[PDB]
Paper text:
The macromolecular machines that execute protein biosynthesis, the ribosomes, consist of rRNA and ribosomal proteins (RPs). In plants, protein synthesis is realized by eukaryotic 80S ribosomes in the cytosol and 70S-type ribosomes of prokaryotic origin in chloroplasts and mitochondria. To elucidate the structural basis of cytosolic translation in plants, we report the cryo-electron microscopy (cryo-EM) structure of actively translating cytosolic 80S ribosomes in a rotated conformation (rotated-2 state) from the model plant tobacco (Nicotiana tabacum) at a global resolution of 2.2 Å. This resolution allowed us not only to build the correct atomic coordinates for rRNA and RPs in the 80S ribosome but also to describe ribosome solvation and metal ion positions, as well as chemical modifications of rRNA residues.
In the decoding centre, a tight network of several ribosomal components facilitates the correct matching of mRNA codon and aminoacyl-tRNA anticodon during translation. The first nucleotide of the anticodon (position 34 of the aminoacyl-tRNA) is stabilized by the tight stacking of nucleotides C1277 and A1432 of the 18S rRNA and Arg146 of the uS3 protein. In the plant 80S structure, three putative K+ ions are found close to the decoding centre, stabilizing interactions between the mRNA, the uS12 protein and elements of the 18S rRNA, thus probably supporting the correct positioning of the codon in the ribosome. Interestingly, the uS12 sequence difference between T. thermophilus and tobacco leads to a change in a local charge distribution, which might explain the presence of the third metal ion in the decoding centre of the 80S ribosome. Another modified nucleotide, Cm1645, directly contacts the mRNA codon at the +3 position. Using polysomes as the starting material for sample preparation allowed us to obtain the tobacco 80S structure in a different physiological and conformational state from the recently reported 80S ribosome from tomato. Both structures come from species of the Solanaceae family and are in general similar, although it was possible to resolve two proteins (eS12 and eS31) localized in the head of the 40S subunit of the tobacco ribosome that are missing in the tomato structure.
Residue numbers in the entry:
A (entry chain J): 2 to 99
B (entry chain K): 2 to 85
C (entry chain e): 2 to 130
D (entry chain T): 2 to 142
E (entry chain W): 2 to 150
The structure:
Amino acid sequence: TFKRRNGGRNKHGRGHTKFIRCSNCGKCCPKDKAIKRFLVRNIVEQAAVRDVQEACAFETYTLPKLYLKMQYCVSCAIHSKVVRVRSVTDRRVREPPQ
Amino acid sequence: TLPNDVDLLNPPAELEKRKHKLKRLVQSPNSFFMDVKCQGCFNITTVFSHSQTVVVCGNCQTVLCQPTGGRARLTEGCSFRRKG
Amino acid sequence: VRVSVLNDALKSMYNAEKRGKRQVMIRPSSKVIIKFLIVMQKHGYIGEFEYVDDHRSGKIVVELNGRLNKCGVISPRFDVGVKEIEGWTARLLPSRQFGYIVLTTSAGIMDHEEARRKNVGGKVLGFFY
Amino acid sequence: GKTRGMGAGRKLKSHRRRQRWADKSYKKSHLGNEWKKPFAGSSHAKGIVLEKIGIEAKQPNSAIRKCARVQLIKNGKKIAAFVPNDGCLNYIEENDEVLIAGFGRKGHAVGDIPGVRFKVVKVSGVSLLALFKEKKEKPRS
Amino acid sequence: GRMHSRGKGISASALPYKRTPPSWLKISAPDVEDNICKFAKKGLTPSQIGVILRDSHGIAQVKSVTGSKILRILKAHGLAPEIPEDLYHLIKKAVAIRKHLERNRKDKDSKFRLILVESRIHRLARYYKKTKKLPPVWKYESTTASTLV
RNA sequence: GUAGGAUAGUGGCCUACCAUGGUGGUGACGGGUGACGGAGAAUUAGGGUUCGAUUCCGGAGAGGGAGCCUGAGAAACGGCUA
RNA sequence: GCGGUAAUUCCAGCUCCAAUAGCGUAAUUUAAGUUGUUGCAGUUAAAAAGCUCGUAGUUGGACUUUGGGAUGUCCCGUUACUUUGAAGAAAUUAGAGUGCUCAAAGCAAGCCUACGCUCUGUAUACAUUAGCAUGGGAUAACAUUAUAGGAUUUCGGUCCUAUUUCGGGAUCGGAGUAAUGAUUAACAGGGACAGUCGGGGGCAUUCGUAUUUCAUAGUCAGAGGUGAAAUUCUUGGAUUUAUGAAAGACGAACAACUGCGAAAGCAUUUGCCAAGGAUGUUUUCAUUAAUCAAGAACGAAAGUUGGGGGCUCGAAGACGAUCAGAUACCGUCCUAGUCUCAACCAUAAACGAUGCCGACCAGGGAUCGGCGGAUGUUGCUAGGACUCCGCCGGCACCUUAUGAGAAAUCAAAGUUUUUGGGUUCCGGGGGGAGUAUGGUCGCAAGGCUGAAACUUAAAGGAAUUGAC
RNA sequence: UUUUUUUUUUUU
Ligand SMILES: [K+]
Ligand SMILES: [K+]
Ligand SMILES: [K+]
Ligand SMILES: [K+]
Ligand SMILES: [K+]
Ligand SMILES: [K+]
Ligand SMILES: [K+]
Ligand SMILES: [K+]
Ligand SMILES: [K+]
Ligand SMILES: [K+]
Ligand SMILES: [K+]
Ligand SMILES: [K+]
Ligand SMILES: [K+]
Ligand SMILES: [K+]
Ligand SMILES: [K+]
Ligand SMILES: [K+]
Ligand SMILES: [K+]
Ligand SMILES: [K+]
Ligand SMILES: [K+]
Ligand SMILES: [K+]
Ligand SMILES: [Mg+2]
Ligand SMILES: [Mg+2]
Ligand SMILES: [Mg+2]
Ligand SMILES: [Mg+2]
Ligand SMILES: [Mg+2]
Ligand SMILES: [Mg+2]
Ligand SMILES: [Mg+2]
Ligand SMILES: [Mg+2]
Ligand SMILES: [Mg+2]
Ligand SMILES: [Mg+2]
Ligand SMILES: [Mg+2]
Ligand SMILES: [Mg+2]
Ligand SMILES: [Mg+2]
Ligand SMILES: [Mg+2]
Ligand SMILES: [Mg+2]
Ligand SMILES: [Mg+2]
Ligand SMILES: [Mg+2]
Ligand SMILES: [Mg+2]
Ligand SMILES: [Mg+2]
Ligand SMILES: [Mg+2]
Ligand SMILES: [Mg+2]
Ligand SMILES: [Mg+2]
Ligand SMILES: [Mg+2]
Ligand SMILES: [Mg+2]
Ligand SMILES: [Mg+2]
Ligand SMILES: [Mg+2]
Ligand SMILES: [Mg+2]
Ligand SMILES: [Mg+2]
Ligand SMILES: [Mg+2]
Ligand SMILES: [Mg+2]
Ligand SMILES: [Mg+2]
Ligand SMILES: [Mg+2]
Ligand SMILES: [Mg+2]
Ligand SMILES: [Mg+2]
Ligand SMILES: [Zn+2]
């Protein structure tokens, strides 16, 4: 039985899509199928922000940010709980969680 | 428009104009011929609205229109009148 | 490609009648199509139809009464003798009380009852009821 | 889709002719292999009893089905034939003359008996049915 | 659809219902034939002649004023080309593709396109042989195709 | 194809000479058939499927080939010759 | 399916049931719409060739004389097909008549007893295809059309023949007559043209960090890796830090329910070379078309032969772990390979598990390319960017059933027992088996084509409940 | 993300 209309990927009007390597296990996975997340977080964790600011060597300074694009295979994405198994009706929802 | 709300033999002119030229009840082109005059020369030349060639006035040897993807673009100086 | 203009016309009328449309469009036109429509109109299965001239094959707009259950083409156009009409009607028509098979005989395009009356055979064009 | 041309009768006939071979019943009766089988297209065949054999019944049943190894006289082929009815194997002896019939499923095994397609009808010219009901007696010689 | 692709475009000309010349047009049929013959002598194909007439001389359709097609007029004056224009252009395209392939052996796409173009050439040439627009001995050969043009 | 021979007679049926022809995916040629063909038989919505050694019609054979006399008629076998 | 110590199923008794002078058992028809022309299937049940071209075959748009007056009748090249007729052994089949006692049958027979009669009867129908003759001229197929060498009247020159100057020919010219002779241009197709568009193809040519190695310099005890370790590298300085060089791969982020390509596939710049769809077109040709045995072009990855390269990763192999074992999963080092050229190979869950062409068929919002119209801005140079309304073409998506379906689902998997638009391929319960054999291609690996004996009651699809 | 192998035949 077929469970997804898109077959678990995002390929339309296309023959082949080159793969990426899973950021967790290194497994090959088509890019249109890999679960991709973009993480933008402060280099200094919120706990240490005050201590680092108190030790600033300049009158003013804005702490940088860390940018990471994570590309997971299906297995790692499920195991890491990046995505979860949804009900038959709920897995047709494509909007990101609020 | 709902099918029973319109007459296939007497469509409103707006709908016929909006339709594709080949999909109208009777095929009719959207092109036309125009009388183009240069800015300075009294000579008057007929030009196709969708000319594929650079029409040049014989007297002053000036380009009247430039071919494009669709309708030809006239030179800024020249003006045209719909001929038909 | 377009192989049977009559098939396209009849299929358009059938689909429009099923949908409930009061009018349908037939393109291209043909004299076989016109004869079929005249046979249908003779028996009250369609209203007035109008031929539109476009310096090409033409177009027809047909009024639909709502009495047409199904009109269809038969392909290939099999040879039908005067003795095979009974079998063809049994195969194609819902009942012996109503329904018509359109044939093309050397005497012209006509329904099967008229063909029986004139004792003329030909080739089967289609059916309607 | 199907071909429908009025001049396409040859193609339809040829396609049906080619596709008939996919039918197992048609192929069985048109390949000419019935003549290489033990009966060679006959309802019955006579043979000589070589040995009595017991065949275990198939799951979920448990029994010893009594059968005889018979060599057909007309071609020398060896087959296994079931001996029906209670204690009817006692009417069979080695080197006896037996008439063999099909098991009813046209060359296929029947019931819980594996790989047996034949049964014994007569022994020494006397039907097994008569022997079972004591209507007749097996000839002494 | 397209013969040698999956394109389904419907872009085409829409001839007007009116078959008569416009009132503002004043040129005469013999004059139009004279210009057509002059253009053909200058080395213009019927398509080019029609395009030039429409774009410059205000002649939307030559048949409207002359009553006949451009190629018919050219033939009546002994000016029609030995081989038809469309077949000529197809052969020109084939020659160009073969010339390109002579220096690009790894260009397999060009080989595919050459196969398609030569299939088109052969089908069109067969049609023209059926209608006696080419001599029965005519045959397209890749080796000496460049000579034909 | 020409001219002959032979035949009850046409015909490469055979001979001499001449020409290169003839058939074929619209399946030639080759192979299988537990294949004599038909009138017919079984079953029957219609279309079809299967069978047809056997008393009527036509053909062929007389253990296998071949040759032949007699005769209007046979390449006969309840005729002959090898 | 019965039988394992309470057997409606075996062996028996009784009783009962079906047919009945018949009944049981062991090739072929029906049922089988499970061979499907009528009339089946091919997304997941068995199934559409990886993709395109293409000859045979099949199929192929529209257009040429209608009407009234009247009354079957008057006025303005070759075939298919259909109607009718002849002819077409009997027996058999259907069928008329007839009390062999009935019947299967047979072709008999009936009145009355007349030295007889019913001329007693012994009908009639059916009969594929092919052939013969006849009426029709719708639908179809083949052939033809315009370099007039055309049709027709008359007349001048040339060449031959017959019945009693003449008739019949066979050619060469002058003149005349005429409405003088060419359907349209398919929301068919090809071709030309214009501005475009694209990660389509080939060749050449810039760039990028990273990896490994090396060179220089600095510091000193660990570094690496794991669930935890060890193999391993390390005071001959590992790892780490800065600069630089070389080599070979790889082209991140941008990058998408986006694009191009027949498919496979295709993502750094710039140039060159041919190619292409869509759009626009009052340009051209005029049926040139659709789909396709045979036969061809291309065809991921792996693999093969020989060069060049050989950074990384890494089949095989070797070690270290884990384990009862561990020929593995985990770690460490590595050959072939991974890259490129020349030549092969031709297979993939080569997938949309869904042939191509054509028509119709609900709604909606997005998006890519082209085009038309309107409108207001831009730190810009009429244009470009954005906004709005439309047309064509494309990749898709959402809702819905009046549709289909075994459902899952599908806006095509719809317009199908109310069954027929054209055309190619291809399946017929499960195994044996994609095996044997033969052929053919390949260096090889193997590819293509492709059985049978025998075995078996299920295998299998979708969905429901429970259990896990 | 250490490690976790197995449960005679028929029938209920
Ligand atoms: K799928
Ligand atoms: K995904
Ligand atoms: K058992
Ligand atoms: K049992
Ligand atoms: K195509
Ligand atoms: K176009
Ligand atoms: K003779
Ligand atoms: K001869
Ligand atoms: K015979
Ligand atoms: K005699
Ligand atoms: K007991
Ligand atoms: K008991
Ligand atoms: K029972
Ligand atoms: K290497
Ligand atoms: K290795
Ligand atoms: K263990
Ligand atoms: K290979
Ligand atoms: K797939
Ligand atoms: K769109
Ligand atoms: K048991
Ligand atoms: Mg599942
Ligand atoms: Mg792929
Ligand atoms: Mg095609
Ligand atoms: Mg189209
Ligand atoms: Mg002779
Ligand atoms: Mg017989
Ligand atoms: Mg026999
Ligand atoms: Mg006998
Ligand atoms: Mg006989
Ligand atoms: Mg004889
Ligand atoms: Mg004998
Ligand atoms: Mg003898
Ligand atoms: Mg003899
Ligand atoms: Mg005898
Ligand atoms: Mg005799
Ligand atoms: Mg008991
Ligand atoms: Mg009992
Ligand atoms: Mg089936
Ligand atoms: Mg499966
Ligand atoms: Mg399947
Ligand atoms: Mg497949
Ligand atoms: Mg092929
Ligand atoms: Mg037609
Ligand atoms: Mg057109
Ligand atoms: Mg460095
Ligand atoms: Mg892009
Ligand atoms: Mg980049
Ligand atoms: Mg090498
Ligand atoms: Mg390594
Ligand atoms: Mg390789
Ligand atoms: Mg395959
Ligand atoms: Mg746009
Ligand atoms: Mg099977
Ligand atoms: Mg164990
Ligand atoms: Zn992973």
